[PDB]
Structure formats: C-alpha cells, structure tokens
Scaffold this motif. Structure first.
Motif, PDB file in Angstrom:
ATOM      1  N   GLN A 255       0.798  -1.222   0.000  1.00 42.31           N
ATOM      2  CA  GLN A 255       0.000   0.000   0.000  1.00 42.31           C
ATOM      3  C   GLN A 255       0.836   1.281   0.000  1.00 42.31           C
ATOM      4  O   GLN A 255       1.871   1.358   0.663  1.00 42.31           O
ATOM      5  CB  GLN A 255      -0.941   0.016   1.210  1.00 42.31           C
ATOM      6  CG  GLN A 255      -1.979  -1.112   1.227  1.00 42.31           C
ATOM      7  CD  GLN A 255      -2.900  -1.094   0.008  1.00 42.31           C
ATOM      8  OE1 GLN A 255      -2.471  -1.356  -1.113  1.00 42.31           O
ATOM      9  NE2 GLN A 255      -4.169  -0.778   0.230  1.00 42.31           N
ATOM     10  N   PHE A 256       0.384   2.280  -0.760  1.00 44.42           N
ATOM     11  CA  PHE A 256       1.062   3.572  -0.821  1.00 44.42           C
ATOM     12  C   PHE A 256       0.428   4.483   0.226  1.00 44.42           C
ATOM     13  O   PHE A 256      -0.781   4.431   0.453  1.00 44.42           O
ATOM     14  CB  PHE A 256       0.912   4.213  -2.205  1.00 44.42           C
ATOM     15  CG  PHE A 256       1.813   3.622  -3.254  1.00 44.42           C
ATOM     16  CD1 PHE A 256       1.464   2.444  -3.913  1.00 44.42           C
ATOM     17  CD2 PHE A 256       3.022   4.238  -3.573  1.00 44.42           C
ATOM     18  CE1 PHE A 256       2.307   1.886  -4.878  1.00 44.42           C
ATOM     19  CE2 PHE A 256       3.872   3.689  -4.534  1.00 44.42           C
ATOM     20  CZ  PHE A 256       3.514   2.510  -5.190  1.00 44.42           C
ATOM     21  N   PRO A 257       1.241   5.333   0.876  1.00 42.67           N
ATOM     22  CA  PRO A 257       0.776   6.266   1.911  1.00 42.67           C
ATOM     23  C   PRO A 257      -0.006   7.467   1.352  1.00 42.67           C
ATOM     24  O   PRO A 257       0.322   8.620   1.642  1.00 42.67           O
ATOM     25  CB  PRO A 257       2.074   6.689   2.576  1.00 42.67           C
ATOM     26  CG  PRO A 257       3.020   6.743   1.392  1.00 42.67           C
ATOM     27  CD  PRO A 257       2.693   5.477   0.645  1.00 42.67           C
ATOM     28  N   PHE A 258      -1.044   7.191   0.567  1.00 44.95           N
ATOM     29  CA  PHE A 258      -1.856   8.241  -0.049  1.00 44.95           C
ATOM     30  C   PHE A 258      -2.555   9.179   0.932  1.00 44.95           C
ATOM     31  O   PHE A 258      -2.473  10.406   0.797  1.00 44.95           O
ATOM     32  CB  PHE A 258      -2.914   7.629  -0.970  1.00 44.95           C
ATOM     33  CG  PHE A 258      -2.355   6.972  -2.199  1.00 44.95           C
ATOM     34  CD1 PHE A 258      -1.275   7.527  -2.872  1.00 44.95           C
ATOM     35  CD2 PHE A 258      -2.955   5.831  -2.724  1.00 44.95           C
ATOM     36  CE1 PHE A 258      -0.801   6.957  -4.052  1.00 44.95           C
ATOM     37  CE2 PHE A 258      -2.487   5.256  -3.905  1.00 44.95           C
ATOM     38  CZ  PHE A 258      -1.411   5.822  -4.568  1.00 44.95           C
ATOM     39  N   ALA A 259      -3.252   8.602   1.906  1.00 49.11           N
ATOM     40  CA  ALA A 259      -3.981   9.388   2.897  1.00 49.11           C
ATOM     41  C   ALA A 259      -3.071  10.305   3.711  1.00 49.11           C
ATOM     42  O   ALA A 259      -3.497  11.382   4.144  1.00 49.11           O
ATOM     43  CB  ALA A 259      -4.765   8.465   3.826  1.00 49.11           C
ATOM     44  N   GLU A 260      -1.827   9.888   3.927  1.00 51.59           N
ATOM     45  CA  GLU A 260      -0.900  10.719   4.685  1.00 51.59           C
ATOM     46  C   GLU A 260      -0.393  11.851   3.792  1.00 51.59           C
ATOM     47  O   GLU A 260      -0.042  12.926   4.277  1.00 51.59           O
ATOM     48  CB  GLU A 260       0.289   9.905   5.195  1.00 51.59           C
ATOM     49  CG  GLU A 260       1.216  10.707   6.096  1.00 51.59           C
ATOM     50  CD  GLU A 260       2.590  10.073   6.253  1.00 51.59           C
ATOM     51  OE1 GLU A 260       3.425  10.641   6.993  1.00 51.59           O
ATOM     52  OE2 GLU A 260       2.840   9.012   5.638  1.00 51.59           O
ATOM     53  N   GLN A 261      -0.360  11.604   2.487  1.00 57.57           N
ATOM     54  CA  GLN A 261       0.096  12.615   1.540  1.00 57.57           C
ATOM     55  C   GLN A 261      -0.882  13.789   1.489  1.00 57.57           C
ATOM     56  O   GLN A 261      -0.485  14.953   1.555  1.00 57.57           O
ATOM     57  CB  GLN A 261       0.233  12.005   0.145  1.00 57.57           C
ATOM     58  CG  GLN A 261       0.922  12.907  -0.859  1.00 57.57           C
ATOM     59  CD  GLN A 261       1.234  12.195  -2.162  1.00 57.57           C
ATOM     60  OE1 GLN A 261       0.370  12.043  -3.028  1.00 57.57           O
ATOM     61  NE2 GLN A 261       2.474  11.743  -2.302  1.00 57.57           N
ATOM     62  N   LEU A 262      -2.165  13.480   1.377  1.00 57.46           N
ATOM     63  CA  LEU A 262      -3.179  14.516   1.314  1.00 57.46           C
ATOM     64  C   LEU A 262      -3.281  15.330   2.603  1.00 57.46           C
ATOM     65  O   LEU A 262      -3.690  16.493   2.570  1.00 57.46           O
ATOM     66  CB  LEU A 262      -4.538  13.896   0.974  1.00 57.46           C
ATOM     67  CG  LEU A 262      -4.840  13.593  -0.500  1.00 57.46           C
ATOM     68  CD1 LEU A 262      -3.703  12.813  -1.145  1.00 57.46           C
ATOM     69  CD2 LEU A 262      -6.144  12.807  -0.585  1.00 57.46           C
ATOM     70  N   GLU A 263      -2.898  14.731   3.729  1.00 57.43           N
ATOM     71  CA  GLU A 263      -2.973  15.413   5.020  1.00 57.43           C
ATOM     72  C   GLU A 263      -1.802  16.344   5.269  1.00 57.43           C
ATOM     73  O   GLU A 263      -1.996  17.522   5.554  1.00 57.43           O
ATOM     74  CB  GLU A 263      -3.049  14.398   6.162  1.00 57.43           C
ATOM     75  CG  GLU A 263      -4.217  13.435   6.060  1.00 57.43           C
ATOM     76  CD  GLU A 263      -4.241  12.423   7.196  1.00 57.43           C
ATOM     77  OE1 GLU A 263      -3.159  11.895   7.550  1.00 57.43           O
ATOM     78  OE2 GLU A 263      -5.343  12.148   7.725  1.00 57.43           O
ATOM     79  N   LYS A 264      -0.591  15.811   5.169  1.00 55.37           N
ATOM     80  CA  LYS A 264       0.615  16.599   5.386  1.00 55.37           C
ATOM     81  C   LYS A 264       0.647  17.837   4.488  1.00 55.37           C
ATOM     82  O   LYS A 264       0.982  18.936   4.927  1.00 55.37           O
ATOM     83  CB  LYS A 264       1.853  15.734   5.126  1.00 55.37           C
ATOM     84  CG  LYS A 264       2.070  14.621   6.146  1.00 55.37           C
ATOM     85  CD  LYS A 264       2.464  15.185   7.506  1.00 55.37           C
ATOM     86  CE  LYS A 264       2.596  14.096   8.575  1.00 55.37           C
ATOM     87  NZ  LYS A 264       3.668  13.100   8.287  1.00 55.37           N
ATOM     88  N   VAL A 265       0.288  17.648   3.229  1.00 54.62           N
ATOM     89  CA  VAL A 265       0.282  18.734   2.269  1.00 54.62           C
ATOM     90  C   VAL A 265      -0.637  19.896   2.637  1.00 54.62           C
ATOM     91  O   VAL A 265      -0.275  21.062   2.455  1.00 54.62           O
ATOM     92  CB  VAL A 265      -0.101  18.205   0.881  1.00 54.62           C
ATOM     93  CG1 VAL A 265      -0.460  19.353  -0.047  1.00 54.62           C
ATOM     94  CG2 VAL A 265       1.057  17.411   0.316  1.00 54.62           C
ATOM     95  N   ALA A 266      -1.827  19.591   3.143  1.00 54.29           N
ATOM     96  CA  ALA A 266      -2.754  20.650   3.521  1.00 54.29           C
ATOM     97  C   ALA A 266      -2.362  21.225   4.872  1.00 54.29           C
ATOM     98  O   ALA A 266      -2.808  22.305   5.250  1.00 54.29           O
ATOM     99  CB  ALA A 266      -4.175  20.123   3.563  1.00 54.29           C
ATOM    100  N   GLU A 267      -1.523  20.503   5.601  1.00 53.49           N
ATOM    101  CA  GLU A 267      -1.077  20.969   6.904  1.00 53.49           C
ATOM    102  C   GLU A 267      -0.240  22.235   6.681  1.00 53.49           C
ATOM    103  O   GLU A 267      -0.118  23.089   7.555  1.00 53.49           O
ATOM    104  CB  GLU A 267      -0.236  19.881   7.584  1.00 53.49           C
ATOM    105  CG  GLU A 267       0.103  20.165   9.045  1.00 53.49           C
ATOM    106  CD  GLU A 267       1.220  19.267   9.600  1.00 53.49           C
ATOM    107  OE1 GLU A 267       1.381  19.229  10.840  1.00 53.49           O
ATOM    108  OE2 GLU A 267       1.942  18.613   8.808  1.00 53.49           O
ATOM    109  N   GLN A 268       0.334  22.345   5.492  1.00 54.47           N
ATOM    110  CA  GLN A 268       1.160  23.485   5.147  1.00 54.47           C
ATOM    111  C   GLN A 268       0.335  24.707   4.780  1.00 54.47           C
ATOM    112  O   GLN A 268       0.883  25.725   4.363  1.00 54.47           O
ATOM    113  CB  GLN A 268       2.079  23.125   3.984  1.00 54.47           C
ATOM    114  CG  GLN A 268       3.172  22.146   4.367  1.00 54.47           C
ATOM    115  CD  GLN A 268       4.072  22.693   5.465  1.00 54.47           C
ATOM    116  OE1 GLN A 268       4.732  23.723   5.288  1.00 54.47           O
ATOM    117  NE2 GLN A 268       4.100  22.011   6.604  1.00 54.47           N
TER     118      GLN A 268
END
Ligand SMILES: Cc1ncc(Cc2c([C@@H](C)O)sc(CCOP(=O)(O)OP(=O)(O)O)c2C)c(N)n1
Ligand SMILES: Cc1ncc(Cc2c([C@@H](C)O)sc(CCOP(=O)(O)OP(=O)(O)O)c2C)c(N)n1
Ligand SMILES: [K+]
Ligand SMILES: [K+]
Ligand SMILES: [Mg+2]
Ligand SMILES: [Mg+2]
Ligand SMILES: [Mg+2]
Lengths: 38, 324, 365, 324, 365
Positions: C3-16
């Motif tokens: 599995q690819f860490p997709f859900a973590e990608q969308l979160e960290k990015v908007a955290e910025q």
C-alpha cells in the motif's frame, strides 16, 4: 456600358442576339423577344 | 537577393526587431531552436533572450501573455506552431485582443501580430494542415493576411508588425521553400487590405489566395493554349477584402470564379461571391462559381492528392463558366 | 498487497496551509507577531473606505431595482478581502479586476460616475483616465489571470518596481486559464499577485463540488509557487498578506497566490438569482457575525480611534457622492453607432468606412 | 396547450429523459437551481442527480466530459451558459466531437446535443448576447439548429437529441418567454435541415432565422399595405441549409433579401447569398441584398436599439430590391 | 516586518514526493517490501513484449526513412513506462493514448498492420475492431485528459469495474486541459489513471523551463488527488504504481496521477528537421546505461528465466510479423473521396449527399 442581369444575358446569347443592339425598356428581359420578332 | 518565402519572413522580423526595441518574438521553440521551419533562426543569438524567447506549452497562455505585454507598451509577435491549434486560443484572439480598443474606448490598444503556418500537400499528421482563416475572418477588429510570394511576404509582415491593431499572418507550409524570388534588401511595406494582379487577362477573372494562386496560374497557362485569357488576382488580405480591385477586374471580363483550399462550407469564398454579386451582378455573363474541397474533415494524409483542389479543377470550372 | 501512503500525503500537504488570522470575531488581536505597521490615521482611513464601500453596495442595489443602473454584482460581505487588499498597493501597481471587483478600481483612481456607466453599458465607462493603471472589469472567468502574467512580465522587462494584482473567485479556480496563468508567472518569475476570493459559491454551486482539494490555496503547488490562506473577514490579515506578497515580488522573488475566506450577504447578481434556493438561511447567520465592519469597529473603538460621529460623517459624504455620480452619468451624451465604429481601429479598413458613411446619414435626421 | 419557448424546451427534455434511459443533462447550475432561465427546472427532482447534475466551472471540461460519456454509450445534453462562452470549448466541439465518427471510420460516434442561449435585446453584460452561429457553421460534421417559435423548439430539440451526430441548439434570449403559442403535448419531431414557409408571398422572398423572423413578418405586414407581397422563410437549421425550399421560393418571386442579427462579416447570410447566386441565377431580377448589423464588436447594452437591425431596416432593404 | 514560511513550505511538499523504485540500474531489488506479485511466466511475457517493442521502433524508423511509413514518434527508451504500465490493465479498461503511445494500443488489441496505416494516413487504420477499448492516438496535447474523465465517469455510471487510463508528456502538464481533466475526475471521484511520461524535453524545451515546480507529480495537489513519482526505466515499479492505482480506482476511491522518469534515445519525430535537431549526446550516453531492457535482463537471468536464445527468438518473430503487417498495409485499397464522405455522418445532410454524386462519377472513369 450594358446593363442587363443575368438570364437576360444568357437568353440573348442562346437566341443568337447581341444585347448591345436592343434598347432595354428596363435593361431587357422581355424586350429581347420583341427584337427577335422585329 | 533571391530568397524563398521563409527567408523573406526571417529578414522582415530582423528588420523590425532592429527598428523597434518594443518588438518581441515568442512561442513554442522559437528561441535557440529557431522554430519548426527555421523562421526565427538566429534571432535570439543576435538580440538576446530578452527579445526572443520560449514559453511553456499552452497556446492560451501565449495569447494572454501577448495581451499583458501590449498593455505595457510592447509590440508582441507571438507564434502558434500550426494554425490547427488555434482552437486552443480562440478566446484570447477573438474574445479579448480584437475587442480591447473597442472595450476601452481607445484608451488601450493591441499592437499584436500572430504568425502561424497552415496548408496541406506535405503529408502532416492530424490537425496540421486545416484552413481555419474563415473563423478569424469573422471577428470584427482583426485583419487576416495570407502571402503567396516571398516579395509579398516581407512587405506585409513589416506592415503587419507596424499596424497598431491585431493581425494574423498565415504562412502556407507548401510555399515556404517551393521557389526563389528577387526581394529588395531593407525595409519596404505593402499596404494591408490591397490585392494585386498576378496575371493580366481579358476573358475571365480567377480570384484566389494562399497556395491556390500558383494552381490558378498553372491553369491560366493551360487556358492560354486554347485562346482563353485568364486574369489572376491575388487577394493577399482576406480581411478586409479589396473590393475595388476585385469588382474592377470582374466588370472588365464579365466572368469570374473563386478558388480556395478550404472546404466549401468554410473559407472566405462565400463572402467574395456575395460582395461581387451585390456590386457588379449587372455585368456578369455567368454565375460566379467556386472551386473548393469536399465538405468533409481535412483528409487523412494518403488521400490529400485526390481531395485537395489542384489546377485541373480550376481549368474544368473555368471552362464551365465560359460555356455556361 | 503493498500500500502507498496516499492518505498521509493529502494530510501533510494541507497541513502546510493553515488559515492566517490577526483579528478574531470579537476584535481581539490573536497574532501579535504579524501585526502590520499602520499609523492611527491609516487605520481610520481603512475604516472610512470600508464603511463607504458598504454604503455603495446598498445604494447600488437600490438604484438597480429602480432601473437607474444595469448589471451589478453585490459585494457586501467582502469589504476586507477587496478594500484591505487594495490598501496594500501603490499608484504604480496594475490591477486586473473581474466583474465583482469594481470597488478596487474605484479606489485606485476610477471616477465613480464611470463605474455606473460600466453598469449601464456605455463605452465612456471603460475609457480609463491615463495614469490610472486598471482594466475594465473582466467578464470571462479565467482570462484576467493569464493576462496578469503578461502584465507582470511586462513590468519586469522595463525594470519597474511595481506589481500586477488580479482577483477571481472559487469557481474560477476550475478554469484552464487559472492554472496556465500562475504557471506562466512562476516559470518567468514575474511580480504578480493572484488573489482568490472564496465566498463559498459560484452562482448556486457550492465550492465543495468544484474540487476535492482540502483548500484552494494549495492549488499554487501545481505551479510551484507559494500560497497562503487567510481570513477574508479579517482586514488586518488581508493587508499583511498582500503586503508581504508585494514586497517579495518587487524584490524579484516571484508571484504568490492568496486565498481569502469570505462571504457575500447578497444575491450572486441583481438579474434574478435567489439564494433561498441553494443555501441555508441559518447558514447566512453564521457569517453574519463574522462581518468585517463589526470586528474592525471594536478594534478601533478600543483605541479611541472611532466614534459613531465619524461613521455618520462618512455615511453622509457617501450618499452625497453617490447622488452626484448618478447625475453625472445621466448627463453623458447618448451613444451613437458612429462612435462605436470610430473606436474599432486606429485606421478604419474599407468595410467600416462604407458603414461609417451609411450610419452618419442615418444619424442626421 | 399554450406554451412559451422555455416551456416547450423543458417539456422536450422531460420526454426524452423518460423514453431514453441513456440521456443525461448537465452543466453549470442546471441541477438544483434549474438554470439561469429555468430551462431545466424540476428535472433533477424527478429523474435524479445521477441523470441531472451540476459540474465544476469549466466549459472545456464540460465538452470533454460529454465526448467521453458518449464513448460509453450515453446520449449527452450539456449546456454552455451563454454562447458567447463557446470560445473556451472550441476545441472539444470543433477539433473533437465533430470529427470523431470520421476519425474512427465510423467505429465511434457522438450522439451529443449542446444547448445554449444567445442574442440581444434584453441589456445583458459583455459577451452574453453575441451571435456566433457562423463559427460552428463552418465545421463539417456538425448540425446547427436555431428555432424561432415554441412549436419549432420542442420538435427540433427532440430530433436533435435523437440525432446520432453532434448538434448545436441555440435558443434566443428574447424568445424565451416573450410570447405564447399552441404546442401539442407528447412527442413529435421536425426534420433537421428543413425550412418552413412562415408566410406565403408572391413579390419577394425574405429569408431569416432566430429573432429576425419575427421582425421579417412584422415587416411583411407593413409592406402588404404598400402592395408588396412578401414570402417569409424561416431556415430553422442554419447548417445544413434547406436549399430546395430556399430555391423553390426564389424561383417564384425572382427577388430576395437575407436577414440576420449578426455582424455583416459574420453570420451565415453570405453562404445563403452565395448559394442562391449559383443555382437560381437565371430567375433573379435583382441583386440579393443582406440586412445585417455593423461590423463592430457587439454593442454595450445601452446602444442595442440603434445597432440591432429591426423591421424598419427590412422594410427599407426590401424596397430597394423591389425598386431595382 | 513579518515573514511567511515560504521556503519551508516548498521543502515540505517535496518530501511528499520521493522517487519510487524497485529495481536499480543493476537489476538488484532495492525495495523488497513493494515487490509486485508476478509468476515466472508473466515476467517472461513482460520481457518479450519490451524487446518486441524495441525492435518495432527500429524498424519503424527504417521504414519511415525508406518512405514506407508516414508520421512516426520514436518510443525507444520508454518501454517500461509504456509496456509495463499497460501490463497492469485488463481487457475491459479503456485506453486514451497520445501520438507517441502506439505500442500500448497494439498490445491492447489493435492489429499491427492497422498501426502502420495510421502512420501513413489511412482511415482503415483508425477503424478500431469492436470490443477493443481504445481511441486512435490523440494529436491535440491535453485533449485526451478531459476526455478520460468522461470515459471514467461513464464506467462508474454503468457500474462496470474497469478503469480509464491516459498518457501525456511533461510539456503537456502545462496545458489547461491537463488541469481541468484531473480536477474534473477528482470532483466526480471517477476511476481514472493519469500517466505523465517525463522524458525531460518538450521538443527542444527542457522541463525546467516548463514550470518552476520540482516534480510534475506534485501537480496532483491542485486537484486534491494522490500523486506518485516513479522511476520510468524501472519495469516492476511502473507495474506496481499502476496496479495500486487500479485497485484504488475500482474500489470507488478515485483517480491517481503517476509521473514516470524515462528518456528517449531517438528524435522527437521523423517529420521535418527533427531527425537533425540538436541532441545533447553527452546526455544520451548517460541515460543509455539506465536502459529498462538492460536491468530487467539481468534481473531475469539471475533467476534463470531469460537466455540469449529466447531473445533472438522474440527478435526474429517481431521482424517477421513486422514484414507481413507492412505488406498487408500495402494490400489495403487506396481511399476515395466517397469513402471519406460516407463516414462524416450516419445520415448524410443535403450538401454532402449532392457532393457524393459528384465524386462518385469523377471516380468511375
Ligand atoms: C467562462 C465563463 N463561464 C461562465 C460565465 C458565467 C458566470 C458569471 C457571469 C458574471 O458571466 S459569474 C459565474 C460564477 C463565478 O463564481 P466565482 O468564481 O465564485 O465568483 P463569485 O462568487 O465572486 O461570483 C459564472 C459561471 C463566465 N462569466 N465565464
Ligand atoms: C495544443 C498543441 N500544441 C502544440 C502541438 C505540437 C506538438 C507536437 C505535435 C506531435 O503535434 S509534439 C509537442 C511536444 C510535446 O512534448 P511532451 O509533452 O513533453 O511530449 P513528448 O516529449 O512525448 O513529445 C508539441 C508541442 C500539439 N500537438 N498540440
Ligand atoms: K499588429
Ligand atoms: K445529437
Ligand atoms: Mg483553454
Ligand atoms: Mg465565489
Ligand atoms: Mg517530453
């Protein structure tokens, strides 16, 4: 210097008539027939 | 010096870059590469990346760019790799720059010139040869120019770049390197909106533009062998039309035909027939016929030969008008 | 399966992309570090202009339902996002407004009677006075964005220390032109400020159906330029954001995208749109309390820099001026078809010369 | 059975949603809102959001979505809020869907219908009232339909939606709910590419489409009071043109004029005029004149009156041709 | 003066897009945890196809120089990102290719002789057999993206468990349609796989001038969908990225953007001066050692799955199949105007009906 348009032009050429000789009562159309008759 | 059309275009751009520091040339691969057909070769090296540069791949952006630049006093000369890609930038051209002088009551203007190759007969992939000048010819505020010779090409581009309103310069792909012609070195201009007589004639007028002028000249030389004297008039600007020259020529011969490479339902042939009919119909000995391609999409490469109008089509139709 | 860490990608990015705020709902300073350097007199002028723009909005609506005006896009509720952003600019800056951004060009130098001519539909409304760097409102969504990058690139080539600023909405972020503009601006590192006014709606369509991006500010990542989300109801935060953007730009560091979170208390436009058909009435009371005039008023009243006496003096000056702009637009000579022909080209081509003659006779009877 | 044109439009959409499960309706604000002019009102609430929905704000996107859906067997009916905005979707309409059948040699096809209002006379903002029928009329592979009455609207839309090739359906703003007419309930169709005589005349043929039809009929009544009997023909399909009906009428009156709301260098009048001159040239008694608007950008709302051609200009041009 | 964390912001998004790789340049597995599940016979089939495709490119170039093929865009060097990506699809998945993606549609069902007719410019080459889900290559850069979002929304509506996959180049990510496409797919949560083949150049324009973004994969953020950057010369990696993207889509989770990092060993196309356009050749040798065939070869040999005798077999087979397809393309009959007119519509409009009789006669004697 000859105003007639445009079938008058083709109708006179089909009957072997030079549109320059006729006197357009209204740039001819029905007076070419009068020429062929006299 | 003897020049081809692409060489005349190149020298005209150089004349303009040198005479006016406001002129800028840009588009896809127009810089170091010098363009797909070498039209801008060597310009960036002579004038710098500040005057001649490349941009991201997006026609819409190239068009917007040109607008902003002109709002800041520059004189943009942008380039669309092939005119079949104008659909991508229709809003900027027709919905924006052609209406700016009007939309600002004169306050701002758009001294822009768009260059773009088009035309068939060279086997290009889809959407590279289409003729869409009929589209741009429909937008008030534009001037569309289409040279057919090197001499006309240099004089018109200079005239197109100096004009202070939007001008589209269509360059036929087949005419780029098909023949040389003596072209004076230095600056000179050809008025925009003026046609000219390529071959003087007395029996029938053949109206054409682009690469159809050549075909018409080849038909005229064939018609001569039978005693038919055809006068070939080259439009050289399809918008606005040079009415006075067209009408003056047809009134002398009494017969006329119009020739375009574009499908019958496109092009500017219909506009030509309409202006002619309402100004000299009392001199017409026969109907003004049209030579055009079938009303289908631009053909797949292998069928171009049997789809595009050639000199034989022009001859057959010209006879049809004489024997009407 | 791997599995690819997709859900973590969308979160960290908007955290910025957290919402930048200075003044909260009750008018308290919750961010002292980012506080702008404004004098007591500049603070009162910012208020005077916001109260004035609110009055212009109410008067426009009224004159429109009376037939006195034509096309009109309400702005009540977006005073901070529009006025405080403009306050961060200088006379040399270039503004490329959209149809709802008429307030910005007014304050930038366009005579108010000309704004009303733009609404009625008269060419003199668009003849901008020389020296006032603005374009008439743009109607086609997206177009002002790709034009701003050109203007910005233009200012850069001449060495000017000015910026091009442009506005659009949430729905406008879906256009192809929106993306090409900030991408061209970035590729050329040009002094352009792109402002997005997220008022949560595109006519009747809610922003949640435009895209799945957590925020609109993050869309700048596609171009590789920095983005900032701020409270559109917070005047002191809009001003600071646009201020930092302007500076970065005149220092040749590139463009910036600013997303303001605001709201419009009025109809999409005065044509026939009715908000009760697509948005809650209880949802209009949630943003009613977040009114920029209310919080800024308390901020100032807490420093003894504002009284109802100064506010009514501005209300009076406003009505008086609105009244004069309206009489001036009426005194404007009617438009003629020969006037429309004369402004088409510098030198009229053959087909318009004919028509010009044809319509010059028809106008003399 | 008295309906306004907008009602006939909605009814025709209701019918097609019932008979053909493959039909889908979409665009900006056409779902819960029911549209700018309430053309799609009540549909979503009856047929479901899976068949009637809103989309992100992007014409180019709406057009690309329609092509794809068609490839998956659906029968799309997208909407461009105003036709002035067609410049954004030019590539999907002309560079794509119009050429899909030809491009794939008949393997795929586009049973797509694009609804869009246009026209002036109600004081709209910039780029909303433009008449750009002439652009799409030049793209082979497309059919452009323009109704002038409630009755013609319902039957044409049904035929359009049923057509297995792309069709552009333009609805004139000023005709939406300006008048009422008898419209039978239930499905019924009117052939595409067929014109109809709106008034039988004997002296002159007046050809028009859209809101100009009304003005033409208006002009015909005034002329009757002067002894001039006019025949009014409504094209109802501007591409293809119904050559037989047009010609049939002209070869009976021997005179004619074409009326359009668009700029003279735009519209489709030039093609109708060209076609008449090539086929009925032997029956004409006078040159075929056009009635059109000036070649400037569509006017700022306040100047619509003096700019848009009306029945009085049609009265004048008709007299010129009769007194020729 | 206040400072926004713009530098940190660009660094944090970069961390979110690391380069995905399974096999290094030596054939060694450097990512066991993500190794795809593929039997011995599937790995051999994946190699045969890549070798076969490399042979096709060499002959296509030869044949084009001989004037026996028309328009052609070289694919050598891009076999992993092309063949290994298509290997993860199923017979029901819909492919919307670009002008350079001819290999993919050949393996999906398009007869080889029909791909040569496409090159030459013959309508029969575009007449895709029924049941084979593909469109002829798209020339207008960007159009295939907005079109895939449509095909995708379609699959979702029929309930079919398939995906729509499309390909574009680095230069293509600059087009507005590219952006509208992935954003539209996101708003509708449609099953679409968007592949971007980054071979570093758009004709002569390096990717660094296309945008100031450091990865093309981060553009997915403006759409709010997952983005992945993979090694484009790594067969197993491209296979895994598309597979993961397929599972995610068919489960109704939405679209995914995949950026591959590959390179081209030959000219942009064979059309004009392209075959003589400037090529770095210092940059070619470098990417030459990174060849997809090279490392996958060593990966299989180490497992005793590939001999130098199977390679020769596949090479002779591709050479023979190529010779008969080019022969069959010659035997297809010339086209006539009537053929091109009969395919403009289902029911011919009056103007074309009339034009059909004119060319019918001009054909027969
Ligand atoms: C390309 C295009 N499509 C459609 C329109 C019609 C239109 C408007 C009229 C004016 O043309 S306003 C609007 C919605 C804009 O919503 P937004 O971007 O959120 O801006 P705001 O909420 O401030 O209105 C549309 C779609 C347009 N102007 N341009
Ligand atoms: C809208 C548009 N503009 C221009 C072109 C011309 C063109 C090509 C011809 C073929 O039309 S190939 C190409 C460069 C594409 O570069 P890329 O996106 O990096 O893809 P790749 O490196 O695989 O070619 C352009 C600009 C086009 N096809 N479509
Ligand atoms: K110019
Ligand atoms: K249809
Ligand atoms: Mg676009
Ligand atoms: Mg909004
Ligand atoms: Mg590339």
């Amino acid at each position: 210097r000859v105003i007639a348009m445009p079938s008058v032009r083709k109708y006179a050429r089909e009957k072997g008539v030079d549109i320059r000789l006729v006197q357009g009562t209204g740039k001819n159309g029905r007076v070419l027939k009068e020429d062929i008759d006299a | 010096a003897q020049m081809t059309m692409v060489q005349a275009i190149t020298d005209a751009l150089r004349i303009e870059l040198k005479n006016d520091p406001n002129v800028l040339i840009f588009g896809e691969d127009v810089g170091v590469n010098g363009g797909v057909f070498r039209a801008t070769e060597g310009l960036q090296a002579e004038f710098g990346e500040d005057r001649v540069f490349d941009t991201p791949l997006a026609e819409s952006g190239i068009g917007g760019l040109a607008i902003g630049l002109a709002l800041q006093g520059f004189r943009p000369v942008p380039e669309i790799q092939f005119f079949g890609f104008v659909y991508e930038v229709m809003d900027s051209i027709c919905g924006q720059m052609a209406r700016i002088r009007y939309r600002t009551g004169g306050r701002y203007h758009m001294p822009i010139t768009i260059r773009s190759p088009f035309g068939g007969g060279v086997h290009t992939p889809e959407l590279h040869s289409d003729s869409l000048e009929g589209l741009v010819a429909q937008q008030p505020g534009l001037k569309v120019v289409i040279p057919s010779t090197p001499y006309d090409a240099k004089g018109l581009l200079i005239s197109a770049i100096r004009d202070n309103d939007p001008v589209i310069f269509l360059e036929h792909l087949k005419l780029y390197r098909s023949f040389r012609q003596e072209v004076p070195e230095g600056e000179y201009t050809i008025p925009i909106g003026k046609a000219d007589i390529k071959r003087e004639g007395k029996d029938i007028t053949i109206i054409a533009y682009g690469a159809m002028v050549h075909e018409s000249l080849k038909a005229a030389a064939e018609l001569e062998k039978e005693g038919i004297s055809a006068e070939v008039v080259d439009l050289r600007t399809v918008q606005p039309l040079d009415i006075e020259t067209i009408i003056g020529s047809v009134e002398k011969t009494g017969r006329a035909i119009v020739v375009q490479e574009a499908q019958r339902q496109a092009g500017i042939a219909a506009n030509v027939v309409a202006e002619i009919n309402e100004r000299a119909i009392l001199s017409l000995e026969a109907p003004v016929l049209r030579v055009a391609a079938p009303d289908t999409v631009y053909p797949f490469a292998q069928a171009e030969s049997v789809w595009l109008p050639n000199f034989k089509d022009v001859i057959e139709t010209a006879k049809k008008v004489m024997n009407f | 399966t791997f599995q690819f860490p997709f859900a973590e990608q969308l979160e960290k990015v908007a955290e910025q992309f957290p919402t930048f705020q200075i003044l909260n709902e009750e008018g308290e300073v919750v961010n002292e570090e980012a506080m702008p350097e404004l004098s007591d007199e500049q603070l009162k002028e910012l208020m005077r202009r916001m109260v004035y723009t609110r009055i212009l909005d109410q008067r426009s609506i009224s004159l429109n339902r009376q037939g006195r005006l034509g096309f009109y896009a309400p702005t009540a509720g977006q005073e901070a996002s529009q006025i405080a952003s403009h306050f961060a600019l200088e006379k040399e800056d270039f503004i490329l407004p959209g149809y709802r951004d008429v307030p910005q060009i007014i304050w930038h130098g366009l005579p108010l009677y000309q704004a009303f001519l733009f609404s009625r539909g008269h060419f003199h409304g668009n003849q901008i006075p020389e020296g006032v760097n603005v374009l008439p409102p743009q109607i086609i969504i997206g177009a002002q964005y790709i034009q701003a990058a050109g203007v910005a690139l233009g200012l850069k080539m001449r060495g000017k220390k000015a910026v091009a600023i442009t506005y659009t909405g949430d729905g406008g972020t879906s256009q192809g032109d929106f993306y090409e503009g900030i991408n061209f601006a970035g590729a050329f590192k040009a002094p352009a400020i792109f402002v997005v006014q997220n008022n949560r709606f595109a006519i009747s369509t809610p922003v949640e159906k435009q895209t799945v991006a957590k925020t609109l500010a993050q869309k700048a990542v596609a171009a590789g330029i920095p983005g900032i989300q701020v409270d559109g109801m917070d005047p002191l935060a809009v001003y600071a954001a646009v201020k930092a953007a302007r500076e970065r730009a005149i220092n040749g560091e590139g463009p910036t995208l600013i997303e303001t979170l605001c709201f419009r208390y009025g109809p999409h436009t005065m044509s026939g749109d009715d908000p009760t058909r697509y948005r809650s009435k209880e949802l209009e009371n949630e943003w009613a309390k977040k009114d920029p005039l209310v919080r800024f008023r308390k901020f100032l009243e807490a420093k003894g820099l504002w009284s109802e006496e100064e506010e009514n003096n501005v209300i009076e000056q406003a009505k008086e001026e609105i009244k004069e702009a309206i009489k001036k637009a009426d005194e404007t000579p009617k438009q003629k078809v020969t006037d429309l022909i004369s402004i088409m080209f510098e030198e009229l081509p053959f087909n318009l010369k004919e028509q010009y003659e044809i319509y010059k006779e028809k106008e003399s009877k």
